DNA sequence: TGCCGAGGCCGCTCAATTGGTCGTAGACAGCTCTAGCACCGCTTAAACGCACGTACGGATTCCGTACGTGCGTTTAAGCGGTGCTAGAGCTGTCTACGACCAATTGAGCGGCCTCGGCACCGGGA
DNA sequence: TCCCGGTGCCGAGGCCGCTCAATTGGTCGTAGACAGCTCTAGCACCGCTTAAACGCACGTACGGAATCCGTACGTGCGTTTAAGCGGTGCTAGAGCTGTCTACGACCAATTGAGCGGCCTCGGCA
């Protein structure tokens, strides 16, 4: 029914399409662009959560607080290159 | 206009494969950080897609542009995995 | 009487979180006048992003943008 | 004893996530710099704006001290000294002070 | 589509009071460098004006936006000097 | 009496306006803005030429080559801040 | 082997312009490796800007865009 | 010599071996075969690479001077690669 | 000493300019009421300063070797050559796709409530 | 100091319902894909012509290790300070709505400055 659900994604293809169009990123936004961008964003969030969980299991904190996200971003090599210049509110430090 | 509910959805979905299988809720501050991460990465990919459109001199940012932008912003092994699962999602969506 | 606000134990705490063990005496003044230069730059760009919006209340969005102007992006404010 | 609480200090301040610099003195510095240095007057700071300024500035100083401890440890030293911070400021292309 | 002739013109205009032993012409490679500098600074100022428009939520990049973009891209004493001479040029242009 | 001549500038008011439009930096572009942008660009170029001559008058080569621009960009603190990340082609290193 | 093509005297040149006097014999290999890492990043981004152009030649503008992508803006190639 | 190389602008890494280096890197680590390099592209890439390594050596000599040393050594380059945001090797 | 590139002329041309309409983006004014400022006393924790002494920086010597320098020999980088063509780039058709729209509607937001995790705390080990 | 059983606070989390943004189908128009042609530039082998790399001998200057002294910096304590709170009181101004209008997009016409093409002669190899 909805574009997000149909694609097997969790992220809003409708909202992403609206942001793309109103963000003036180009005159037109091909219909495949929002679905793919939603999938990419969804998978990046999944990857960040995965890394936070793998670095968290030792700390075993049930939640995910900004410190865990900062650890995930600062530890994995690829994620570190992606978010090298990313400070995080109440980030703490990645051991 | 935040990606709060969607980040909740993806968190619950990723719990399924993880052996932890905990509801694993995200703290409000952590929720804001993840939301700002989604917005920052979306701005980065969409801006790179805009620059790629202007480079190739086209008025539309197709799937080619968002894919090349995801290959630029998100490089490496995690980048290949994410673009592959994104191609999976797009193929599933387009075949309907 | 401005940088004195960034008190000696404040630099001590900052640096302990950073990782150092023993801090010299010149480091206090030097980090005070490094933090002051960073704030000069970030607050110049943030006051620009404010005065452009025809405002005078520097918003945290203005700060996030002024930082993103120097590549340092903040997550958790907008 | 001269280093017995240094490890406790570093562990205690790396396990937490709070804001290290006291909030009102840093806010006072921000307002003082906005009026003294910039010369702009009657500028009011949103609370979240001072908060993001403080978080980013203290995270910048903390990364500066990481890089300073790296510089020291490279000089086969234990005490970060003004040359160490000057190197961590010149090498990592940070904002050098005026003078 | 290069700013070659215009850079020549600004060089001559500045040189009418600089070292006048000769017209200090700019070497071809130097011309390419200055052309790319103009393009880079124009893209930087225009991109900052775009971001400032999107911030203030306006479809047009007025003089306010190019001025704030010049105050962001070109900071310091030289930034004030350049924006002042730009306001001189703009006042001269509008009064005509 | 084109706009470039009218404004006292030498930089192309029309070309900058066209680039600002086709670049899609914004939907509309108030024709008072390209004038200011061209003036800022001309002033920057004049300033960089001024400081190249300022730092080179010792050599009296009577010509500007990319090394001259490199030294001008990377000597004075204001230009050094503007063009910190620049790497001029065939430039060399600042004296 | 290809990387070893950056001859030892070429690295000595690079470093003398950078203002070094005496170069320990291990700096040669570490410089070769950091140059290879730099070129791997810049060439991945340049190949991406090329593959997006649907063409098989990485042009000067592709490399310039890659470098802008990672921070170092080049002047004088287009 | 420091003077002759510092003041000149002529390229430093010999063009052909560096061209082989860039071609091999694109054809081996990246593994994209049948990639053709425009001459200007390899020239610009080499210019940027040598400029980045020259700045890396500037920071290496800074770190060396800082260690009360006259010979730059591998720990110095590792510091000038870690303190700066330069791309650490593989 | 001549040779070629910065600079100047030439003619086409394409991009800049102007004049006028329309509609629309936005400057402004007026209203709301959030929230930033100020302020005060009180708590109290945090800062300050001084005493003290340990340990760290640095100043010094000194030996080992890992550097530069200086040869000759070897090499492969450079260049000019032509030749070979993949493939970049420009054009011209068209159609598969996106904008736009109205109407449909249901996902998503805030508002309100809850209870289980956790900061805290005190105990015990 | 760790390691854990109660405790009270509060934020994750769930349910609702109102809303506005997402979705669908249809027109209609046009962007881009796709093919076809043109020839630029990359590439490749080749062979000289060097000039740079290389490998080794040498020896010296420098890294580092080892020691020694002074002092500066950490630790602790008592005294002083002001950060923070939170609670109130004040108003500036951020922001949101509505209005009205000056201005820019767009088209049609016009026009001349800027492009490459071509030339020349003085700065330079």
Automatic annotation (TrEMBL), chains A, F:
| Family under the similarity heading | Belongs to the histone H2A family.
Question: What's any one GO cellular component for it?
Answer: nucleus
The segment(s) forming the Core Histone H2A/H2B/H3 domain are 1-74
Biological source species: Giardia intestinalis (Giardia lamblia)
Q: Partners and quaternary state? A: The nucleosome is a histone octamer containing two molecules each of H2A, H2B, H3 and H4 assembled in one H3-H4 heterotetramer and two H2A-H2B heterodimers. The octamer wraps approximately 147 bp of DNA.
Indicate where this protein resides in the cell. Nucleus
Please give the Gene Ontology molecular function terms for this protein.
DNA binding; protein heterodimerization activity; structural constituent of chromatin
Per its record, how is this protein called by name?
A: Histone H2A
Give the signal sequence positions.
none
TrEMBL record, chains B, E:
Query: What does the record list as coiled-coil region(s)?
Result: none
For this chain, the family text in UniProt reads: Belongs to the histone H2B family.
Return the protein name.
Histone H2B
Where do the Core Histone H2A/H2B/H3 domain residues begin and end? 1-72
Give the GO molecular function terms: DNA binding; protein heterodimerization activity; structural constituent of chromatin
Q: Name one GO cellular component term.
A: nucleosome
TrEMBL record, chains C, G:
Keyword Nucleus attributed: yes
The lineage's top-level taxon is: Eukaryota
Give the function comment from the record.
Answer: Core component of nucleosome. Nucleosomes wrap and compact DNA into chromatin, limiting DNA accessibility to the cellular machineries which require DNA as a template. Histones thereby play a central role in transcription regulation, DNA repair, DNA replication and chromosomal stability. DNA accessibility is regulated via a complex set of post-translational modifications of histones, also called histone code, and nucleosome remodeling.
List GO molecular-function terms, semicolon-separated: DNA binding; protein heterodimerization activity; structural constituent of chromatin
The opening ranks of the lineage are:
Eukaryota, Metamonada, Diplomonadida, Hexamitidae, Giardiinae
Species annotation? Giardia intestinalis
The protein's name is Histone H4
List residues traversing the bilayer. none
Q: Which UniProt keywords apply?
A: Chromosome, DNA-binding, Nucleosome core, Nucleus
Q: Name one GO cellular component term.
A: nucleus
Domain CENP-T/Histone H4 histone fold residues, every copy: 11-72
Q: What does the subunit comment say?
A: The nucleosome is a histone octamer containing two molecules each of H2A, H2B, H3 and H4 assembled in one H3-H4 heterotetramer and two H2A-H2B heterodimers. The octamer wraps approximately 147 bp of DNA.
Similarity annotation? Belongs to the histone H4 family.
Q: Subcellular localization, per the record?
A: Chromosome; Nucleus
From TrEMBL, chain D:
**What's this protein's family per the entry?**
Belongs to the histone H3 family.
Q: Which GO terms describe its cellular component?
A: nucleosome; nucleus
Task: Identify the species of origin.
Answer: Giardia intestinalis
Q: Which UniProt keywords apply?
A: Acetylation, Chromosome, DNA-binding, Methylation, Nucleosome core, Nucleus
GO MF term (any one)? DNA binding
**UniProt KW Transcription keyword:** no
Stated name of the protein: Histone H3
Domain (Core Histone H2A/H2B/H3) ranges: 3-91
Q: Where in the cell is it found?
A: Chromosome; Nucleus
Instruction: Please give the function described in this protein's UniProt entry.
Output: Core component of nucleosome. Nucleosomes wrap and compact DNA into chromatin, limiting DNA accessibility to the cellular machineries which require DNA as a template. Histones thereby play a central role in transcription regulation, DNA repair, DNA replication and chromosomal stability. DNA accessibility is regulated via a complex set of post-translational modifications of histones, also called histone code, and nucleosome remodeling.
Subunit structure of this entry? The nucleosome is a histone octamer containing two molecules each of H2A, H2B, H3 and H4 assembled in one H3-H4 heterotetramer and two H2A-H2B heterodimers. The octamer wraps approximately 147 bp of DNA.
Q: What is its main location?
A: nucleus
């Amino acid at each position: 029914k909805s574009r997000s659900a149909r694609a097997g994604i969790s992220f809003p293809i409708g909202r992403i399409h609206r942001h793309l169009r109103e963000g003036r990123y180009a005159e037109r936004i091909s219909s495949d662009a929002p679905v793919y961008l939603a999938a990419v964003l969804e998978n990046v969030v999944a990857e960040v959560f995965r890394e936070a969980c793998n670095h968290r299991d030792k700390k075993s904190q049930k939640r995910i607080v900004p410190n865990h996200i900062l650890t995930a971003l600062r530890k994995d090599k690829e994620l570190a290159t992606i978010f090298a210049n990313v400070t995080i509110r109440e980030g703490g430090v990645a051991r | 206009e935040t990606y709060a509910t969607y980040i909740y959805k993806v968190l619950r979905s990723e719990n399924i494969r993880s052996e932890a299988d905990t509801d694993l809720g995200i703290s409000n501050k952590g929720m804001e950080v993840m939301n700002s991460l989604v917005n920052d990465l979306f701005e980065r990919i969409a801006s790179e897609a805009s620059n790629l459109a202007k480079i190739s001199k086209r008025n539309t940012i197709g799937k080619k542009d968002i894919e090349s932008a995801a290959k630029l912003v998100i490089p490496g092994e995690i980048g290949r995995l994410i673009r592959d699962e994104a191609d999976k999602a797009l193929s599933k969506f387009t075949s309907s | 009487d401005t940088l004195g606000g960034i008190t000696k134990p404040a630099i001590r705490r900052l640096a302990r979180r950073g990782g150092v063990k023993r801090i010299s005496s010149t480091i206090y003044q030097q980090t005070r006048e490094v933090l002051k230069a960073f704030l000069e730059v970030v607050l110049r760009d943030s006051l620009t992003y404010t005065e452009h919006g025809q405002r005078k209340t520097v918003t945290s969005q203005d700060v996030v943008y002024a930082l993103k102007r120097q590549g340092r992006t903040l997550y958790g404010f907008g | 004893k001269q280093g017995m609480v240094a490890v406790k200090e570093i562990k205690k301040y790396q396990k937490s996530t709070d804001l290290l610099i006291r909030k009102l003195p840093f806010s006072k510095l921000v307002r003082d710099i906005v009026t003294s240095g910039l010369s702009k007057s009657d500028i009011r700071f949103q609370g979240a704006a001072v908060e993001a300024l403080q978080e980013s500035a203290e995270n910048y100083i903390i990364s500066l001290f990481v890089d300073t401890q790296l510089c020291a440890e490279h000089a086969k030293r234990v005490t970060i000294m003004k040359p160490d911070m000057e190197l961590a400021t010149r090498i990592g292309k940070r904002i050098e002070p005026e003078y």
